[PDB]
Design a protein around this nucleic acid. Sequence first.
RNA 1: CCUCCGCAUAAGCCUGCGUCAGAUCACACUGACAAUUAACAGCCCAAUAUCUACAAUCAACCAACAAGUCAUUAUUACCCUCACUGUCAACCCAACACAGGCAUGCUCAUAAGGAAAGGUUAAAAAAAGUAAAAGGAACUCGGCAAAUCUUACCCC
RNA 2: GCUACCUAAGAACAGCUAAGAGCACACCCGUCUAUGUAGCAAAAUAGUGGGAAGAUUUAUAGGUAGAGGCGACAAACCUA
RNA 3: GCUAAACCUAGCCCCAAACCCACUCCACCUUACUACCAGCAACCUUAGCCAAACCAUUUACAUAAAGUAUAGGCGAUA
Lengths: 46, 109, 176, 111, 236, 376, 322, 158
Amino acid sequence: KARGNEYQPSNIKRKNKHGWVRRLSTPAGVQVILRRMLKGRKSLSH
Amino acid sequence: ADRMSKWTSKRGPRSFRGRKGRGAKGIGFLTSGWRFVQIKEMVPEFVVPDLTGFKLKPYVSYLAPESEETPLTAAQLFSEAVAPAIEKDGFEPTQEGKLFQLYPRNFLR
Amino acid sequence: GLEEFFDDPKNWGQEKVKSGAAWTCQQLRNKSNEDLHKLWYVLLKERNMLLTLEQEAKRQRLPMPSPERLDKVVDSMDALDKVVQEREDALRLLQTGQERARPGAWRRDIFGRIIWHKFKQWVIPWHLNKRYNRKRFFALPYVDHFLRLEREKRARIKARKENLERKKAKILLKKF
Amino acid sequence: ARNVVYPLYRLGGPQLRVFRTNFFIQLVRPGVAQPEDTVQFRIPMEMTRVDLRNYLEGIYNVPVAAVRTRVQHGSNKRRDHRNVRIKKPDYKVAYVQLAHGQTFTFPDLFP
Amino acid sequence: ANFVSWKSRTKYTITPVKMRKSGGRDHTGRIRVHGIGGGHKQRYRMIDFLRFRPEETKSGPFEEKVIQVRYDPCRSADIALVAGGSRKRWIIATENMQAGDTILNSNHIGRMAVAAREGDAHPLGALPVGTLINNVESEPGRGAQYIRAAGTCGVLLRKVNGTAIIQLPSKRQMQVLETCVATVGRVSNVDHNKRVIGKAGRNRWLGKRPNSGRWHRKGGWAGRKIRPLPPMKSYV
Amino acid sequence: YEWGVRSTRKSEPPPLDRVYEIPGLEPITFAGKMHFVPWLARPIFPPWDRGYKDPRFYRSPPLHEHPLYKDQACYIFHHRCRLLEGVKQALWLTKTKLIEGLPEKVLSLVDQDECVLNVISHARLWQTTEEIPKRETYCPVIVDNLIQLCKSQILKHPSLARRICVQNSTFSATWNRESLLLQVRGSGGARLSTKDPLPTIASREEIEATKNHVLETFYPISPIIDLHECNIYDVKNDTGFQEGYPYPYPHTLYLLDKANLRPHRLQPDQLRAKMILFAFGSALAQARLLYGNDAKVLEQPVVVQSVGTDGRVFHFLVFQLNTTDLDGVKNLAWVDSDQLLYQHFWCLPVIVEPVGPVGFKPETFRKFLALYLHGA
Amino acid sequence: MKYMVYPQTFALNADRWYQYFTKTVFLSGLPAALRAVACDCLLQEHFYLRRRRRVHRYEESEVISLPFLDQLVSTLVGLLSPHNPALAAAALDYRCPVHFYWVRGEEIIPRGHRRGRIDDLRYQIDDKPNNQIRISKQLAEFVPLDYSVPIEIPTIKCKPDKLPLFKRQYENHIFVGSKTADPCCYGHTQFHLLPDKLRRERLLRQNCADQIEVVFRANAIASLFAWTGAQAMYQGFWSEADVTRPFVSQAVITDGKYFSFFCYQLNTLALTTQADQNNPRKNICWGTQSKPLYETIEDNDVKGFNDDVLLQIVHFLLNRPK
Amino acid sequence: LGQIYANNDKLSKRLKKVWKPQLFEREFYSEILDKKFTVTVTMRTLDLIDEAYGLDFYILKASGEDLCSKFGMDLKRGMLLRLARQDPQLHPEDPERRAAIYDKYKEFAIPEEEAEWVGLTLEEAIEKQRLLEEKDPVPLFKIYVAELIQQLQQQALS
RNA sequence: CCUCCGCAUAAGCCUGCGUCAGAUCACACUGACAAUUAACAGCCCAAUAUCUACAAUCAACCAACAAGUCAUUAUUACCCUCACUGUCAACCCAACACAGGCAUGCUCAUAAGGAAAGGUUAAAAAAAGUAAAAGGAACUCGGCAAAUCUUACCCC
RNA sequence: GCUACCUAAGAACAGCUAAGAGCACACCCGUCUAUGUAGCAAAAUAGUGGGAAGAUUUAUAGGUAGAGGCGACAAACCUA
RNA sequence: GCUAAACCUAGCCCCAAACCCACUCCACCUUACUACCAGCAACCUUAGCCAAACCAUUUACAUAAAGUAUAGGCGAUA
Ligand SMILES: [Mg+2]
Ligand SMILES: [Mg+2]
Ligand SMILES: [Mg+2]
Ligand SMILES: [Mg+2]
Ligand SMILES: [Mg+2]
Ligand SMILES: [Mg+2]
Ligand SMILES: [Mg+2]
Ligand SMILES: [Mg+2]
Ligand SMILES: [Mg+2]
Ligand SMILES: [Mg+2]
Ligand SMILES: [Mg+2]
Ligand SMILES: [Mg+2]
Ligand SMILES: [Mg+2]
Ligand SMILES: [Mg+2]
Ligand SMILES: [Mg+2]
Ligand SMILES: [Mg+2]
Ligand SMILES: [Mg+2]
Ligand SMILES: [Mg+2]
C-alpha cells in the first residue's frame, strides 16, 4: 500500500530513543554528542 | 518534529505535561491520593516596611553634585569598624549556630 | 490600593513628564541598610507602574509619555542591587573569607571541558543520593582526541582573527 | 524572588523571607470583557499564585479574594531575512478577584 | 535489553502469582528457543516439592487434609491444595486423591516396611519393593525433581545397603540414598496422553508458535536407533 | 528449593579494593572529591543516621525492639480472616453448640411484600445511572433499605425509637482456649445498638444441658489455621465506645460482604463463621464491661444477633453468650443458614422473562423482621 | 460540550451566576426527646465512638461529620413517623446522585470553522447530596404558579466562562436519585454538607468572609434546582411543554456546626431563548442565614446548644403531601 | 596478543593468537606486614620470589616497571612506610623480634616523606596533593586585625 | 442539493481564516494587539513484618476450558491543606490547502458538518452511467465485463 | 515511531441463523475488472470481492540490529 | 527597451611567531536546560580496499651513509 509515512510521531519514544540521557548512557552516544559539539550544531541531542 | 523549539510543559503528552512546569519553586509536597500539602515555611513571606514619613523618592534631583566612585571592599569596612579595636589596645569564628549564614546562604536576597 | 499601579491622574495624556536622574551608586552607598531596603520598595512600585504604562501604550498603538524614566528607574534598581550585594560580599570576606556565597568547585564533566559545578543543596549525603551518582564527572580516553580537535579549531579561529587584523592594518597604512 | 537559590526547608526550620523582592509585575487591560472585581496582571513565569496574593497584600495593601494564574504561549512563527524563527516570549497571566465587592474599572490613559 | 525475571518472590505462598511470559527469549533479548509465546495468561501456584517439611517448631511425621484438587495451567499434572496444622500449601496431586482426604508425611525409615496409601509420602527405605512412586528426590532434603508429569510413575526396583534403586519413566535406572523421600502411586490426571488437540488454535492458546516453513533435508540422526538402556545413574 | 532467583536479589557489593588489606596506610579514595572516579579506590562510608525526624521519610525500629512485643503469639481475627474449616472451627474457637433452627420466641414475634420487592428492584436496578449496578454498590443498600422498612413499624411498637444503627464502630475481645491466646477485631459493617439488653433465649436448664455434648475436633487442621498469627498485639478488650454512651447494648451486627469478584467474597460457611465470631466478640466485650475480666459462668448471659451479607443470600444468627470461663458449660448459637430472598434478578429483558426479581420468597424477610423486633 | 456546573463551588459571588443560569429569584427568610437524640448523635462521633486510626484535619469532614449527619437524618425520621406518616413509606437515599441538564441562551461561536453560528449554550449539574428523602406523592405548593415578586434576576455582563466554569462533553443526564421506573419519583428534604474547601475557617483565612453565606446559597440554588428539574422531567415536562403544576423541594445545607434551610419553587423549565420571550414565570429560592447548631463540645457536653435549628429541621421533615 | 602462521610456514594462513599465562591462587605470609594474602600469582612469580628468598624481599628488590602490578606497588609502599616509621607491627611481647625483622631489611627503608608517594598512579598522586593543600580559607578579618596590630606596634616603636 | 460524515477525548502539532493596520481564479499573506483562568486531566501514597485456594461471562440455574483483570492485617510514625503544569485554532503523518493513513466515546440520519456545476457550446476520440427490436455466448484465451442468479463433475 | 517477531498492561467486534460454524455492519485484508500511469497516490479511486468471537483486529510503552536480527521460507521484513 | 549586465571588500588560503580556551545571577546526565531524600562503572593486535596486472604469504603510512647491508610467493615490493 502507500508507504510514504514511515514516521508516526510520539514524543516519549523520541525522548527515549534519541534523548540526551540515552546518548550519555553509552560511550558511542557520548562520542556522537562530542562530534556534534565539534561541528557546532545548535541541537546536540533531541 | 522540531529540535530547535525550546522543550516545555506545553509540548509533550499528558504525563509529560503534568511533570515539567516552569521555574515555579514548589510550595510543599504531595501525598496519599494526590493531596497537595502547602507548608507555610516554604512559601516566601514578603517583608515590606512602612513607607510613612519616608523622605526618599525613586528619582534624584539633578542639582545633587557629582562624586567619584569607591567600591566598598572589605578593608574599608574593617577600617570603618576599627575604632573599637584601636580603643582596645565583634567577630564570629563559625556561623553554624546562626540564623542568617553568610557563606552557604540561608537568607534569600 | 490599585491606584499605585498608575501615576498621578494629572499626568494621564501629557506626552512629556519631568522625572530627574537615576540613583548613582555613591549615594546608595552613603545610605543605611534599612533605608536602602525602604527605597527598594518605593522603586519597585514605580517600576511596576512604568511597566503598566508601557503595556497600555502598546495596547493603544501610541508611544510612551517618557520612556527614559523607566530606564532611569531600572538603572537605580541595578545600582541598589550592586551596593547591597557588594556589602554582603565584604561581610562574607570578613567572616569566612569566601568570594561567592553559593559554593561550587572545578569539575571535569564527560566531555572533558572543565566546568564550575555550582552545588545544588540537598537533604541526604552525596554517597547515597541515587540521582547524583549517575551524573558522572570524568572523561575517559575517547574524549582526549575530541578535546584536541576543539583546541585546534579554536587556534584556527584565533589565527584567522589575527591575520585579518594585520591585513586591516596594512590596508589602513596603504590608504594613509 | 526570581533567579535566586531558595534555601532548603527541612522540617523544624525557620520561615523563608524575601527581603528586597526580585520580580516586578504589570496590571493590564483585559481583552475579552471580564466581570467587575477581576483584575488582570502579567506575572513573570517563576512567580506563583500564592506569591502573587502575598505580593499584592504586602506592597499594595489590596484585599485579594482569589487568584487564578495561566501560562500564555508567545508565538514562535515569524521569521527573519535568515528564515530563523523569532520567538515572542511566553508569559504568565493572573486573574485576581478583589474582596469586599471592591470593584475596579481599568482607567482611561491617553485622553 | 531490559529483562528482570518474574521469578522473584522469597516468601512461600498459595495466592496465584502474576507471571510474565518469555517468548523463548533470553536476558539478552534474542530468541534462544523457537515456538514459544502468545498463549493465554496464567498465574503461578507455587508448588511445595519438598514433600516432608514440618511447620515451624515441629519435628516428626505429620498428617495433612486435602481441601481442593485443582487444574494447574503451568503443567500436565493437576494439583492439590493441602492443609496441616496452621499452614496450607499446594502440592502435586496423585491419582484418585480426593477432597477431604487425609495424607501422611513420614520421615521414618521403619524396621519393617510400610503399607502405603496411594497419596502418602515416605522415605524409599520405608516402602516395599515394587511400589509405584513419583516426586522422587535425587538426594536427602534436596526436593522432588523426578517423575512429576501427568500419569507418571517410577517403580522402586530394589534396596541394597543404605541405597534404593529406581526405574524412571524413561526406563533408565537411578540409584539414590535410602532416606530420600518420595510419594507413592502415579501422578494425577492420567489420560493427558490421549488428549486430542483438535486444531492449531488450541496449540496457539497453549502458547506454542508454529514450526517454520524452512525445509530441512533429514541427516544421519534421522534413522531409528536401537540402543541398550544407558548405565544406571547413581547419586552416592 | 530456595525461592527468589539470584538475578532479582540485591547484587553483591563489588569486591573490596586491595589497598584496604594492607596494614597500615591511608587508601586514597574519591571521598576527597564528591563523586565517583574509576581510578581512586571505593571509599567505605560510615552508616549515616538522619538527626532530626521527618515523618514522610521515617523508618520504624526492628520488631525485636518494640514497646509491646510478646513471645507468646496472639492469634487475631478480623473481617478479612477467612477460615478453612468454616463453622465447626468457629464454634471451637468460640466454645459453643450450633442449633439448626432460629429460636421459637423470635419466630413468634412475627405473628408489605410489595414494599420488599420494590426495595429489591431499587437495589438491583434503579439506584444509579448505569444499567446493572455492582454488588459493591447494592449489597449494603439493600440491607439499609430493609432496616428502614423494619423501622417504619415505630408507629406500631413505640419501643423501637430506643435504638440506632451505627457505622464505624469497632471492637476488640481477647481470650484463651487450650491454652493459646485469641483475639477478635472490629467490622467494616453496621451495628444496631439498643439502650436495653436483650432477654435470654435459653433457660438455665438448657444451658446446663450443654455440658454433655462435646466440641468437634477437626485434626489435623489446627483451629487457628487461617487467623493472623501476631506477636506485638496488646491484650486490652474493648467495646467500641467510651463510658456513659447511651445506646450501649449491642442488638444485631449488620455485617455485610460487598466485592464484585467471587474470590474476594467470603463463601457462605466462612461468612457464617465470621458472623459467629463477631457475635462472640461483641458479646464477650459486653460481658467484660459488665463484670470483671475474671473468668466464670454468667448469671445474666448476654445475647447478640447478627444478619449475614449479600444482596441475594441471607445468613441469620443469634448468639447466647453464657461463659467467660473457656478451656464445663458452653455457649450456644442459633443459625438459619443461606435462606435468601430472590434467586435471580434480570436488569434487561431476555429473548420471555421480564425485568425483575425471579424466585422471590418473603420468609427470609419475615425472619429478618423478627430478628429486628426481638426486644419489642 | 457543555458548562460543568458545580453546586458546592469555590467561585466568588457564584450565587448570582447560578441564578442567571437557572432563572431563579432568591428571597431571604422562608415562605425534648428529639433534642436529646440530636445531642447523642453529636457526641457519638466527636467523643464516644473510639477511633482506631487517628483522624487528621483533612480527614475530618469525611469521617466525623457525614456519618453524624446520616445518623441525624435516620434517627429523626424514625422519631417523626408517628407525627408524619409519609416518611414511613418514603425512600431515604444516602449519597445517591442527582443529575440535571438544561439549555439557557444562545452563543455565537467566536472562532474556528464553526465561527458565527448560533450555538445554544448548555449546562449540567451532577450533585451527590449527603442524603435525601424521596416520596411517591408530590409535596405542597408554597407559592402560586405565576407569582410576580418584583425584585428581578441578576444581569451578568459577560461570558459564563469568566466565572471559573469550564466546558466538557460527556453523558447528558437527567436523573433524580433513582430511575424513572420507580414510584418514589418526587422528593422533599435534601441534606448537604460542604467539603474541606468551603470550611468557613479557610474563607476567613482568605479575604472572602463575605462569601461564607454565599457558597451555601449557591449550593441551594443549584442542587435543589437540579432535583426539581429532574422531577419535572420525570413527569413529562420540558422546555417546550413547560410545567403545569409547581414542583417543589426542600434543602438543609451544612458544615458540622452551621446549618441553614432552603425551600425551592420550580415554575419553569422553559430556559431556551425560544421559550423565554413570552415568559413571565420564574423559579424561586427561599433561604436563611447559616446559624450554628452549637457553640462547642467540651469533652462529652455540648456547651451552647441551639434548638431553633432543630425545630427548623423538624419542620422541614414534617411537612406533608396533601 | 600476536599472530601465528598456520603450521609455522609463511606460505600458509596468518591467524591471530592470544597466549595466556597460567594463573594460580596462593596464600602468602609477609613479616613486614604480618598478614596472609591470597594472590593470583603465576609460577614465574613464585620462582622470582624463591630467587629473592622472601616475598617481602622480592617486593622490595623488584623495580616498579618489572613488578607490573598496582597491588604489588601498594604493598611495597606499605612495607617502606613500616620500615620508616618503625611502627608497632607485632605489638607488645615481641619488641626484640620486631627489631630483628627491621634489621633483616636494613637495606631499602627510604625516608618517610618519600615512602608515602611510592607506588601511586598520577591521578592518585594529584588527589593526595589536593588533600594535603586543601584548607578552609583564612578569614580576611583576622589578617586585617593582624595588620592593625603590626601598625600599632610600629607606632609604639616610633 | 449533499451528508460514507459530525461533536468530543487520546496521540500529534504548537498560535497556523480572533481585532486593527498594511500590501499584492478572486481579497487563511506581513506588522501590531489580544487571548486558553480548575472542579476535567496530569503531578501520588512513612516504615517493618504479615496476609491474599474458590475467575469472567446481567452471576442466578446450566456449563466448561485456554484456568483468569480490581482485597489486607499488626505495630510503630504522622495535623500541613489545594501549590505546579495541559486547557487556542480551520490542527497530525504522507515534500502540498495531497481522493491516501489515523486510536477510543457518543451521534447512526443528524439538532452536527458541508457544495458535484468560473462562463458557454454541445463535434470526434476517451471515461462513468442509463436504453433497447429480434436473437441469446454465435463473443473471447476464458461468459473477462455486464445482467439474472444458481445444475452437475473433475484436478489439487 | 515502517514492517518481522515477541513482552507488559489495555480496547473493539451491530443485526439475523444455530463450533478457529453460516449470512452480514463497524473494522481488517486485497480476488477480478475498469480508471489512474509527472497520478488524488514513489501503489490511489470506482465497483466486485476474502475474512469479520479469533492462529481476529487494534491504540500505548518496552525488547531482538547487520559476520546480525526476525521469519505459518516468500531468501519475506528490518523507516519509499 | 525590458530582462539583465557590471562593479570591491566581506572575508579566506598558505606561512611565520607564540603553547590555547573555558562562573553576571538561574538552569542543565530524570524526558538536559528539570530547586528539595537510602547504590552498576575505562583499559582487550585495527581491518580492508589496493599492488602483485587473478589470488591465497606479502603490499610504504635537516643532509649524507643509501635506496647500501638486509628482507621478500627472493616478486610485487619493503
Ligand atoms: Mg512438527
Ligand atoms: Mg516443513
Ligand atoms: Mg477545546
Ligand atoms: Mg508523497
Ligand atoms: Mg447544517
Ligand atoms: Mg464546485
Ligand atoms: Mg468548467
Ligand atoms: Mg437486446
Ligand atoms: Mg470466433
Ligand atoms: Mg466460441
Ligand atoms: Mg464475472
Ligand atoms: Mg467464523
Ligand atoms: Mg464469513
Ligand atoms: Mg521456496
Ligand atoms: Mg527462490
Ligand atoms: Mg590485485
Ligand atoms: Mg591495472
Ligand atoms: Mg575476478
